[PDB]
Structures are given as structure tokens and as C-alpha cells.
Design a protein around this ligand. Structure first.
Ligand SMILES: [Zn+2]
Ligand SMILES: [Zn+2]
Lengths: 213, 56, 49, 280, 49, 231, 116, 148, 202
């Protein structure tokens, strides 16, 4: 019943997560993404059958090519949360633990909602950041949708080349907003340029450039 | 030409006849409306359908 | 057309909107005066005759 | 109308008009038809009055945007809107519908058209097509070229499938090719039943070369050349299809001067089809 | 019952010259009357003429 | 429209008075539960009371209008389903004349009250210029023709042509018509063409034109040249 | 639903549970008047409502000239002279089922062959 | 087909019981007294004043030269009589109100011991509330409670 | 719908059943309130069968209501799953009974553990309006449409391939997007504002 269905939703979302994490350039194998629902249920569901999220939380490491292009990029930690509404104390734990392991970024998935205090404490560890996603929001990866053309984040060197070649100021680029689902998805930050390849019905391949607000 | 005229005439008349039958049916509550469409909606919809078909 | 008849017969026509006057009725009247019953008429070009 | 008893849904009552204008209308018909006409005059006045006030907004918003020499389409502030006008850089005046031959057709008929294999007996050219076809037969250097070419076309079909989902084979593109061929044929009196003097290395290297002389963005660097390619991508895919070796020799029977002059013109008109910077 | 129709013509009254001149002439004659009264106050309170 | 006219209105008092004498119960005695079926009675939106026999009442009134006792302009209505009888002596209503059809006859079915005798009695007047000058006022006092507003137009039923649609029962050229099946016609239209205004009246055969070409003609006909006045 | 009124207060009676006898009464809060209930029923909403369809039938309805006439015979008196009209309730989903009204016995009988 | 105007030429070429008397009282009595109907809203049908007990009573409960606005005699007199009457024992209380529309035509027929009658014209007509039945006067306090 | 199930009409009907907003008022013919002090025994002679079955301290007031069987059909429902819904709505404060599908008259009765009526009649509204029986909110009148779809053949030319597609009135994109059994990739709405919100700027 409801238990089973909830398991299903949680699984699909979990798939989405790995997908995004690979897209950011962290190493996960195709099969590791493609692990079927039955295997996942056995791996993280208890003998009663209820799933265990605290077992699901896991580390992501950068792919070699990624280290090559973005040397600064560090490893990532992913937590889920079992609490339906996330407590500030749990948030504190996540903050501390990440600072402990010295990851460059962190990701926290919540079930329903989080106390405003916990949200306020999120920007407390520069340069490290905390991306916060809702479980129910991640159920379906958006990028697989037809209307969403492929995105690519860029290296500053590549960027300075872009601006120089078109003779542009950053302001003059078409702008994209941080709250954008895609922006969240790739975990963009301000002044970071993305490339978009949209398939055109006139040119047939049309590049484009945008810059987070 | 006349033979065409009478042919048009009947071609309309039968259309009216169909409409009349739809009327009798729905008056007798024997008509079942298309889902999402109210009964009288489905009625008008049909009647107009027949009519434009006739004119064409 | 109706005018063309009124012209010939010397009786003004009744154009009143809703009546029993019918095109065929006119056509017959006109034919009686010897013109083509639909009002078409043979014309010659002015330049070349 | 007062002339009908209550709850009369017959189409005579609710306004069906049976008589044609030639026969005239009964009065309760006429009145209805006047109601319809009035609706037609009213809405027409509204649409006109409103549509103009849209025309003004669309103008005032878009009035400042022009196409700079760099071919970026960018408004007053210098803000980049499009990195290449219309994404292919082509003036809407010069563009025509054209048939994409690669996108449509069955697997088999497609291969039957574009595939040329000298080693296998199925798809080999008839030698009388071109003067040297006999000695050409079986030669490996050429068969390899044709292999690369054919693979190119196939992978292009894989592409166009991904671009156009429904696979509509007709799209606006510059430079009507069909008319160029026809003009050339009639021009030089291309004579069927006689062998061509075209070599295959002549054909393939002719096309692959001509592709390089189609230019929109003339900048020299990685980024620009990336755009230049992504700009001419589709049009190229059309071109290869129309100039495919089989299609050239079997159908058009072009001679040397014919095929040359065609390559020349295709590029010549092409460059005319690029937008003129300074355009508003 | 249906929502009442605002455009039912039997519920619209037309106003020709008569009703118009009635309205306007009313407010004129009020203004007139009132002015005569003011004049009476001025002459009686001031005892002139 | 040509025959349309605007009501100049009259005084309600004589009507309101007249009602009570014929048995209208004054409002203040009304006990809704005890007299459930009585038709309540409006005059110019003012509700003065009720009446228990609207049928006969409404007959009395209509008879008075047709005698010309009440000014014909007054428009009375009886809504059967609503249990209301409305009256308007008010000014500013619009009304058009019609023939009054009557079932009451020596012979069979219903017929218009106007008959040839009246007609010749009119054209005697017209062609003349014998006595008493039988004219529109006469036609209205004798109850042949009656004025009807849009309100009273609710409760009646109208026939387009007298001799087409009155009697109970085809070349291909003529237009197709409806039937006479309705036996209740209370009123018959004088002539349908009169639904046209002045501008349209000049259009020949406007039935055969698409409507907007009638409109454009209605406007353009106003600016044409032509002799405007003899003087 | 069919609520009564007080005596000499005339006001509507609000239902009062009797906890002593565990039975229902009717109180008038303006006075001491209370009387017994006649049914356990108190409130009925009736979302789907078929009443009002036949509304507006009047003793004089047979005199209405604007109403059409029909030749169908009455099931009771078998008089073929009758007047018909559609459901008086005005709503989108209101069916077009006719209501035939005889001019002899005044009886109301529908045209619906599905449900009667 | 055409319009016929030759109608000048056409019209010229064609043309046990019991009988009890009634009387109008000497007006002196009328001069002394005005007569007024009584009506109750009770719904309690009986309501004879005998039932109403007793003791019965029935009783009603510097500028410079400037402008006055004009008014009628009958209306002014009626308006000046705005203290309505009332009746009690020493408690049941009825409060009346001028009907105002029914003066109209009302003729009184008094049944006297002999079958003959006397007839007096009706002055006014009043409608008596039975007032203060449940006897809660909640006034300003009630409005304040309403402000909840 | 997903490509595998695109041809099936009945799977489609399942999804329509899984989205279109369903309210208790939609299926409710009428409701009525009764005074029945004894919790177990009911004065009503008809319902005594229900008393006999569905049984084998609480409010003296009864709330009772009747459903359209046609509504139970057009919108597929089960008297049980309904009573499930209400039970898991109000939890234990309101006892619940419901009649069988076999019953020619669909009946539902409920009671509760100082002017009780207004509180009960209040709860009646929460029942009709505030209970979403099943499906996604804001959506109405989901229409099955057979749309032809151009799809490559195994032999490579295109083939017109009819498939069942659900048009929809009202828009909530996120949830509908998440519902299992559909194809999240091709989902579409005609209001771009939401496309912007959910799927971003591009
Ligand atoms: Zn009371
Ligand atoms: Zn009968």
C-alpha cells in the first residue's frame, strides 16, 4: 500500500539524485545509477520493509576530467533526512559534519519542510555551501524533459575567452536567475557562465550562453 | 438548374429530419451526453454539427 | 434586371423586401419584351467594332 | 422571437437560415442574419482597435534591436539577445522551402538511393554513367572515400531525426538548390545516354571543399569556428544529400563544367543569403 | 430563475424633448425660485426696496 | 423602425382607482398562506395588492383599452407562471402597432378583426382627400389595431402574414416558409417590412443582401447628394 | 426542514436534545415554550435537487397563448388536448425532458421513457 | 411585378328573509366621538378584551429674518400626532400603529337589540401589536453583544 | 502516457482515474441529519440491515448521506476506500459506517465522541468541500483523446501511430509530473508561466 508506493517515489527520486550528481561531474557509474527498484529496496529497506534513509546518504567524488577542468572542485557529501520536518539540531549536525570531513560543498534532502533557523544557518561556512532540496521536488529529473536543452557549466578561463571574443561585459550576457530549477540542478553560483545547446529548426544546432545573476 | 434545386431541397430536409430525431431522443431523456459535456451542450453540439454538414 | 423590365414596360417595379416577387417571374417578363431573359446582352467592342 | 411558441428548439426557431440569397429570406430569418452581421461588425471594430495597440507595444519593445557587424543581434545597451541572428544568420528575404531528402524515406529506399559500393555487386554504378567507371570499379582508395561519405549521410539522418521529431521533410532554407541543378542542366545541355567526365574524387572533394567556403562568422579562433559550424550545420546536411555521388551521376548526369559552375553558384548565392549587419 | 437580462429592450425607456426639457427646466426653475428668495432676504433684512 | 413610436405616458391614478372597484384586494389585507393562488398586481413597479380572478380582470382591462377608454398607450401584461399582472402607464416606453386576431367568429377558426369593409372605408378617405373621415384613430378606437411595447410582447404570439398563416391547409422559385400549426395567434403583424428603419427602407430587396452591405448602405445613404428641400 | 413555530412567539423552534429522557424536543429561545419532535429528522441539504422542475403550474396555464400545443393523449383521462413545457428549474445540467399538462384533468405527465 | 399607382382610376371606376332598516345617526354623537378599528397581530384567535382582564386603560405614550418651509394641513396634523397609544391592566400590553392606507371606504354597521342597524363612518384603522411578550429588553447591551 | 502503454485505452482510464480531482460533493446526492441517541440501535427501519452487518459513549446526533451510484461508476470509487479516506482524515474522533455496493441505496453514517449541531453541520461542509477523495487538485474534466503520432517504422519510414493522450483542464504541473504510470518526458501545459517555474527559463 502507501508504504510500497512511498518506497517507489523515494527510489525514483534517489535515481534523480545520482543523475544530477554525475552531471555536476562527480563519479558514479551508469549501472550504479541504473540499480533497479528491487535491489534498492533490499539494500535500504529494513526487514519490516520501511526504508532507511540514514543508510542511503553517501559521498560523491569528482571525476578525473572534472578535476582537470575545475581544479578547485572538491568532493561532495549527500544527506537525506528521516525527520518529516527537519530540526535545527539536525541541520547543525549536517553543517558540523561537513565542516569536519572538509568537503567543498554539501547537499541535504528534506521530506516536508525545514525550520527557518536551519535555513538561516545554511550560509555559515564559506567557501563551502549547502544545497537544500525537497524529496518531493526531485521525484522527476527535469533535464530529461524534451523542452530542456542540454546545459554545460564553464571554466573561468573558457569564460574570459568567451567575453573577450564577443567583446562583452558580463552584464551584457543574457542572464539566468539563481532560483531557476536548472540553475539549482547544476548548483550554479553568481557570475558563472552556462552554455546551452538547443536543437534549432533553422540552424539545427544553436549554441547559447547565459550567466547566473 | 431545377434538378439541383430539388436535390438541395431534400438534402436540407433530411438534415432537419435528423435534427428532429435528436430532439425527440433528448426530449425522452434517451440521449447520453459525451463525458465532460453537459446534456444540453452535447445536444446543441450535435444539432450544429448536422447543420453545417448540411450547408456544406 | 427588374429596372430593365420597368424601363421597357413603363411600370415601376416593387422592390419591397418581403413579397412574392421571384427572379424567374422577372425573367419571364423580360423575355416577353424580346431581350435575353437573364439580362445578358451582346455587346461590341468600341475600338475595333 | 414572438412568432414562436415557447421552448421551440427547431433550427428554424433558433436561427438556421434555409433560403439562399438568390431566393430571399423570410423575415424572422432576415432578422437573425442581421444579428450575425452585427456581431461581425462589432468584433471587427474591437479586434482592429486592439490589434493596433499591440502593434505599438511590439514595436516599441523591439524597435532598438539591430544586427551588428559581429553578427550578434543586440539592442541599444549592447545586451546580447542572439549570438547569431536567427541562429543561422540568414536574411528572411532570401529563404525558401526545400525538401530534406535524408530525413524521409524507408531504410531500404534510402540506402538504394545514397549507397554506392564497387566491391559488392548490388549497388555498383553502371560504368556507362562516367567515362572511367570501369577502371574505377573495385578501387580501394575510392571505396573508402565513399564509405566515409555514406557514413556521414547516415549519421546525419540520425541527427535530423533527433532535431525534427515528426520528420517533416520540408523546411525553410537558403539557396534553392533544385533550381540551380535545373538551370545548369538546361544551360549546358546535359545529354542523357552519354558518359560523364566527372571523377569521384572530383565529386566528393568538390563538395567537401565547397563546404569550407560557406562562411557566416569570419572570425579566427576556437569559439567563432564552433559557431560558424553550428550555424551552417543544417544547410550542409541539405547540401550533401543533394550532391550525393549516386544522385549526381545517376540522375543529374552533370559534366565537369556543369558541376563546377554549380559549386560556384551555390556558394555565390549563399553569401548573398547572409544578413547585412546594420539591418534593423 | 435566470440572471436578469440587462439589455431587454422593454426595460429601457427613451427620453425625447419632453422629458429632457422637463429635467432641465426643473433645475432652472428651482434656481430661479431660490434667487427670488435671496432677493427678498436682502431687501427685508436691509429694508430697501 | 418606421412604425415604432415612443410613449408619452399618462396618469396611473384612474387605473389604480378602477382596479379596486372590480375586486382587487388591497395589499394590507393580504394573508399569503390563506389566499395562496391569487395573482398579485403591479402598477408601474408599485405593488398595490392582489386579485383572485386575473383572467376576468385582464379581460376587463384589455376590453377597456380596445374601447379606447384607457389610453391605448398603456401596456398591461399577465404572466401566468409568475402569478403577476404588470401594468405600465409610464412614459418613455416604445411600442408598435399590430392587428388584433380574434377566435370569436361566426365561421370556424381565428381571423383578424379588420375586414375589407373597413379598408374601403379608409381608402374612401384617402382618395377623397365621405363624412367623419374614417382614419387611424378610428381603427384604434374600434379595437382592430393595438399598440404593443416590448414588455407586453412577452405574453403574445404573432403571425407574419395574415392570409398565409391564419388559414388552415408550390413553385420552386419562392422562398420556404414555416407552418400555421399554432392555433393561438393573438396578434398579426401589419407588414413585416416595417421592421426596417428609414435608411434601410430605401434599399431595394434588402432580403437579398448580406447584412453589412445593408449597414454600409444605411450609412452612405445619409451623405448622398439630392434635393433636400424645395425652398 | 418543515420546522414549526412557537405559540404567541411565532418564532422558529430550534431542536433541543433531552438528556434526561434522551429524546428530541423543540425549544423557542424567546420563551419557555417547548414541544415534542415528530421525527428524528432535523436537517436535509439535498445537493442534487429535482424539485422545481414542475414549478409554476397555474390553474390558468391552459389559457397561455405562447405555449405550444400537443396531440399526445393523457394516461388518465385520455384527452389529447394538452400544453407542454420544459423543466422550470434553470441550470446547466437540467435535462430537456418535457412536462405535458393536460387541459382536462390538469394532470402533469412527462415525456420521459427512461424513468417515470 | 411592378408597383400599382393606377388606384385613382381603379377606386374612381369602382366607387325565509328578514328586512331590517338602516339609519344614519344624529351627527351629534359623531361630533362627540371618532371611531377607530382594532386589529391584533396575535395569531391567538380569541383575544377578547374581557380576557385581557383589567383595569383597562388606553392612552398615548438671534435669528435674523429667515425662511420657513411649507406643508399640508392633514399631513401636518397626522405627523404632529406621533405619540402612539397603548393599553394595559395594572401585565399585558398592546401597541398600535396607524394603518394609513385603509381609511378609504369603511362603513360601520352596529347591530342593536332590534334587527335594525345604525351605521357610522370609520375614522381611522389601527393595528395593535402584542408587545413585550417574552419580556427581554436587551437594548444597547444586545447591540454590544452583536458586535461579537 | 509511457510508450509501452500508449495504445491501451484502459491503462489510460487508470491514469485519468489517478489525477482528475474527486470531491465528496461530486458523488453526493443528498445528506440528512438525524437525532438517534442510542449509539448502536437505529430508529430508521431501512438501515437496520446495515446495523445488522456493519456492527458485528458517542454522540446522540447522526450525520447521514447518500451517494449517486452513477457517480460511483463514472468516477470509480468504493464505499470502503471512501470510508477509509474519511477515517484517515478525521482519525478517531468521528465514527463511520458505510453501505455496501450491493445495496440499491448507498448510505453513509457518522457520529462523534453544548450546542452540538453547529459543530456537526460545520463538519458536513468539511466533508463535501474539504475532502479530496482521490486524484490531483485543481484538475478537472480530463478528456481522453486519440492523437495520431508520427513514429519511425522498424523499416525506417514514418508511420502514423495513434495513441491515447489526456487533455486536462486546470494546471498543477509538479504533482501531475510526478504521478507514476505516465511519461514525465513529454508532459506539456499551455501556460508557460508554470513551465518557467518548474522547468526553468529555457
Ligand atoms: Zn416562543
Ligand atoms: Zn388528462
Amino acid at each position: 500500500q502507501e508504504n510500497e508506493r512511498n518506497i517507489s517515489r523515494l527510489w525514483r527520486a534517489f535515481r534523480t539524485v545520482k543523475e544530477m550528481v554525475k552531471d555536476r561531474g562527480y563519479f558514479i557509474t551508469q549501472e550504479e545509477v541504473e540499480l533497479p527498484l528491487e535491489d534498492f529496496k533490499a539494500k535500504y529497506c529494513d526487514s519490516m520493509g520501511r526504508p532507511q534513509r540514514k543508510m542511503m546518504s553517501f559521498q560523491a567524488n569528482p571525476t578525473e576530467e572534472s578535476i582537470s577542468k575545475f581544479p578547485d572542485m572538491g568532493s561532495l557529501w549527500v544527506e537525506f533526512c528521516d525527520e518529516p520536518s527537519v530540526g535545527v539540531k539536525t541541520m547543525k549536525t549536517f553543517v558540523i559534519h561537513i565542516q569536519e570531513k572538509n568537503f567543498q560543498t554539501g547537499i541535504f534532502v528534506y521530506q516536508n519542510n525545514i525550520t527557518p533557523s536551519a535555513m538561516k544557518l545554511v550560509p555559515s561556512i564559506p567557501p563551502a555551501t549547502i544545497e537544500t532540496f525537497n524529496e518531493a521536488a526531485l521525484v522527476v529529473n527535469i533535464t530529461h524533459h524534451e523542452l530542456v536543452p542540454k546545459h554545460i557549466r564553464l571554466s573561468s578561463d573558457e569564460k574570459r575567452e568567451l567575453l573577450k571574443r564577443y567583446r562583452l561585459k558580463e552584464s551584457q550576457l543574457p542572464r539566468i536567475q539563481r532560483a531557476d530549477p536548472v540553475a539549482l540542478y547544476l548548483g550554479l553560483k553568481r557570475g558563472e557562465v552556462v552554455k546551452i545547446i538547443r536543437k534549432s529548426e533553422t540552424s539545427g544546432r544553436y549554441a547559447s550562453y547565459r550567466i547566473c545573476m | 438548374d431545377g434538378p439541383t434545386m430539388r436535390e438541395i431541397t431534400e438534402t436540407i430536409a433530411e438534415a432537419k429530419k435528423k435534427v428532429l430525431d435528436v430532439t425527440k431522443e433528448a426530449q425522452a431523456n434517451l440521449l447520453t451526453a459525451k463525458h465532460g459535456m453537459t446534456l444540453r451542450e452535447s445536444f446543441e453540439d450535435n444539432v450544429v454539427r448536422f447543420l453545417n454538414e448540411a450547408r456544406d | 434586371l427588374l429596372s430593365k423590365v420597368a424601363a421597357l414596360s413603363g411600370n415601376e417595379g416593387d422592390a419591397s423586401p418581403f413579397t412574392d416577387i421571384t427572379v424567374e417571374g422577372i425573367s419571364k417578363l423580360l423575355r416577353e419584351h424580346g431581350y435575353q431573359s437573364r439580362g445578358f446582352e451582346v455587346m461590341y467592342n468600341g475600338h475595333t467594332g | 422571437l414572438p412568432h414562436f411558441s415557447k421552448d421551440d428548439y427547431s433550427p428554424e426557431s433558433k436561427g438556421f437560415v434555409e433560403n439562399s440569397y438568390l431566393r430571399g429570406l423570410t423575415p424572422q430569418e432576415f432578422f437573425f442574419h442581421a444579428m450575425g452581421g452585427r456581431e461581425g461588425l462589432i468584433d471587427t471594430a474591437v479586434k482592429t482597435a486592439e490589434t493596433g495597440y499591440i502593434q505599438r507595444r511590439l514595436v516599441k519593445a523591439l524597435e532598438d534591436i539591430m544586427v551588428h557587424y559581429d553578427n550578434t543581434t543586440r539592442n541599444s545597451l549592447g545586451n546580447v539577445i542572439q549570438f547569431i541572428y536567427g541562429e543561422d544568420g540568414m536574411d528572411a528575404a532570401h529563404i525558401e522551402k526545400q525538401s530534406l531528402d535524408t530525413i524521409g524515406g524507408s531504410d531500404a529506399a534510402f540506402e538504394k538511393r545514397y549507397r554506392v559500393d564497387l566491391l559488392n555487386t548490388d549497388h555498383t554504378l553502371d560504368p556507362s554513367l562516367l567515362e572511367s567507371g570501369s577502371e574505377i570499379l573495385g578501387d580501394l582508395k575510392l571505396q573508402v572515400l565513399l564509405d566515409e561519405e555514406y557514413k556521414q549521410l547516415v549519421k546525419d539522418r540520425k541527427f535530423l531525426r533527433e532535431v525534427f521529431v515528426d520528420g517533416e521533410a520540408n523546411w525553410p532554407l537558403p539557396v534553392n538548390i533544385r533550381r540551380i541543378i535545373q538551370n545548369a542542366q538546361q544551360t549546358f545541355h546535359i545529354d542523357h545516354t552519354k558518359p560523364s567526365d566527372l571523377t569521384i574524387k572530383d565529386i566528393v572533394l568538390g563538395v567537401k571543399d565547397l563546404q569550407e567556403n560557406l562562411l557566416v562568422l569570419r572570425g579566427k579562433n576556437e569559439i567563432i569556428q564552433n559557431a560558424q559550424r553550428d550555424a551552417v550545420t543544417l544547410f550542409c546536411c541539405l547540401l550533401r544529400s543533394r550532391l550525393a555521388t549516386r544522385r549526381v551521376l545517376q540522375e543529374y548526369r552533370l559534366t565537369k563544367q556543369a558541376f563546377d559552375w554549380v559549386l560556384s553558384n551555390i556558394e555565390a548565392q549563399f553569401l548573398r543569403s547572409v544578413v547585412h549587419p546594420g539591418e534593423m | 430563475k435566470d440572471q436578469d437580462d440587462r439589455d431587454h429592450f422593454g426595460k429601457k425607456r427613451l427620453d425625447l424633448a419632453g422629458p429632457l426639457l422637463a429635467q432641465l427646466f426643473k433645475t432652472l426653475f428651482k434656481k430661479l425660485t431660490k434667487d427670488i428668495f435671496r432677493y427678498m432676504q436682502r431687501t427685508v433684512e436691509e429694508a430697501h426696496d | 423602425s418606421l412604425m415604432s413610436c415612443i410613449s408619452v405616458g399618462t396618469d396611473p391614478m384612474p387605473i389604480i382607482t378602477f382596479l379596486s372597484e372590480w375586486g382587487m384586494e388591497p395589499l394590507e389585507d393580504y394573508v399569503p398562506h390563506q389566499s395562496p393562488d391569487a395573482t398579485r398586481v403591479f402598477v408601474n413597479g408599485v405593488w398595490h395588492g392582489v386579485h383572485r380572478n386575473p383572467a376576468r380582470l385582464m379581460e376587463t382591462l384589455r376590453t377597456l383599452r380596445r374601447k379606447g377608454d384607457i389610453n391605448p398607450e398603456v401596456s398591461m401584461i399577465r404572466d401566468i407562471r409568475e402569478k403577476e399582472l404588470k401594468i405600465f402607464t409610464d412614459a418613455g416606453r416604445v411600442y408598435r402597432p399590430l392587428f388584433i386576431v380574434e377566435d370569436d367568429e361566426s365561421l370556424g377558426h381565428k381571423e383578424l378583426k379588420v375586414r375589407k369593409g373597413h379598408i374601403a372605408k379608409l381608402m374612401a378617405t384617402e382618395y377623397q382627400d365621405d363624412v367623419e373621415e374614417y382614419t387611424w384613430s378610428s381603427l384604434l378606437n374600434e379595437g382592430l389595431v393595438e399598440y404593443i411595447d416590448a414588455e407586453e410582447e412577452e405574453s403574445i404570439l404573432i403571425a407574419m402574414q395574415p392570409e398565409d398563416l391564419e388559414p388552415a391547409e408550390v413553385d420552386p422559385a419562392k422562398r420556404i416558409r414555416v407552418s400555421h400549426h399554432a392555433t393561438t395567434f393573438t396578434h398579426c403583424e401589419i407588414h413585416p417590412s416595417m421592421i426596417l428603419g428609414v435608411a434601410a427602407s430605401i434599399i431595394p430587396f434588402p432580403d437579398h443582401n448580406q447584412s453589412p452591405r445593408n449597414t454600409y448602405q444605411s450609412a452612405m445613404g445619409k451623405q448622398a447628394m439630392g434635393v433636400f428641400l424645395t425652398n | 426542514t418543515t420546522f414549526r413555530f412557537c405559540r404567541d412567539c411565532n418564532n422558529m423552534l430550534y431542536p433541543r436534545e433531552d438528556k434526561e429522557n434522551n429524546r428530541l424536543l423543540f425549544e423557542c429561545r424567546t420563551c419557555s415554550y417547548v414541544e415534542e419532535a415528530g421525527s428524528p429528522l432535523v436537517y436535509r441539504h439535498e445537493l442534487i435537487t429535482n424539485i422545481g422542475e414542475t414549478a409554476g403550474v397555474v390553474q390558468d396555464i391552459g389559457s397561455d397563448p405562447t405555449l405550444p400545443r400537443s396531440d399526445r393523449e393523457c394516461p388518465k383521462c385520455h384527452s389529447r388536448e394538452n400544453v407542454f413545457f420544459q423543466s422550470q428549474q434553470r441550470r446547466k445540467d437540467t435535462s430537456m425532458v418535457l412536462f405535458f399538462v393536460c387541459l382536462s384533468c390538469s394532470h402533469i405527465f412527462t415525456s420521459d421513457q427512461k424513468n417515470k | 411585378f411592378i408597383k400599382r399607382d393606377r388606384m385613382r382610376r381603379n377606386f374612381l371606376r369602382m366607387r325565509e328573509y328578514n328586512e331590517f332598516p338602516l339609519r344614519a345617526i344624529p351627527k351629534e354623537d359623531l361630533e362627540n366621538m371618532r371611531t377607530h378599528l382594532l386589529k391584533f397581530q396575535s395569531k391567538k384567535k380569541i383575544n377578547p378584551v374581557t380576557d385581557f382582564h383589567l383595569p383597562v386603560r388606553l392612552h398615548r405614550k438671534r435669528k435674523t429674518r429667515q425662511l420657513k418651509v411649507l406643508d399640508e394641513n392633514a399631513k401636518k396634523l397626522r405627523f404632529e400626532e406621533f405619540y402612539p397609544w397603548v393599553m394595559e391592566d395594572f401585565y399585558n400590553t398592546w401597541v398600535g400603529s396607524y394603518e394609513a392606507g385603509n381609511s378609504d371606504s369603511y362603513v360601520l354597521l352596529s347591530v342593536e337589540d332590534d334587527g335594525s342597524f345604525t351605521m357610522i363612518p370609520a375614522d381611522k384603522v389601527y393595528k395593535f401589536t402584542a408587545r413585550n411578550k417574552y419580556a427581554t429588553l436587551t437594548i444597547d447591551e444586545a447591540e454590544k453583544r452583536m458586535d461579537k | 502516457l509511457e510508450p509501452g502503454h500508449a495504445a491501451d485505452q484502459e491503462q489510460a482510464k487508470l491514469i485519468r482515474s489517478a489525477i482528475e480531482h474527486t470531491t465528496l460533493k461530486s458523488v453526493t446526492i443528498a445528506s440528512e441529519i438525524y437525532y438517534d441517541p442510542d449509539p448502536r440501535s437505529t430508529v430508521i427501519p431501512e438501515d437496520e440491515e446495515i446495523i445488522q452487518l456493519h456492527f458485528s459513549q458517542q454522540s446522540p446526533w447522526l450525520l447521514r448521506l447518500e451517494l449517486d451510484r452513477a457517480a460511483m461508476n463514472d468516477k470509480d470509487l468504493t464505499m470502503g476506500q471512501v470510508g477509509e479516506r474519511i477515517k484517515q482524515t478525521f482519525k478517531n474522533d468521528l465514527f463511520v459506517i458505510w453501505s455496501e455496493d450491493n445495496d440499491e441505496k448507498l448510505i453513509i453514517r457518522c457520529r462523534v465522541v453544548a450546542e452540538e449541531d453547529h459543530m456537526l453541520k460545520k463538519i458536513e461542509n468539511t466533508m463535501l468541500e474539504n475532502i479530496t477523495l482521490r486524484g490531483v487538485e485543481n484538475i478537472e474534466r480530463v478528456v481522453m483523446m486519440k492523437y495520431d503520432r508520427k513514429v519511425p517504422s522498424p523499416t525506417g519510414e514514418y508511420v502514423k501511430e495513434p495513441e491515447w493522450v489526456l487533455e486536462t483542464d486546470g494546471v498543477n504541473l509538479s504533482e501531475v509530473m510526478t504521478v507514476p504510470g505516465i511519461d514525465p518526458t513529454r508532459i506539456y501545459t499551455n501556460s508557460f508561466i508554470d513551465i518557467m517555474e518548474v522547468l526553468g527559463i529555457e
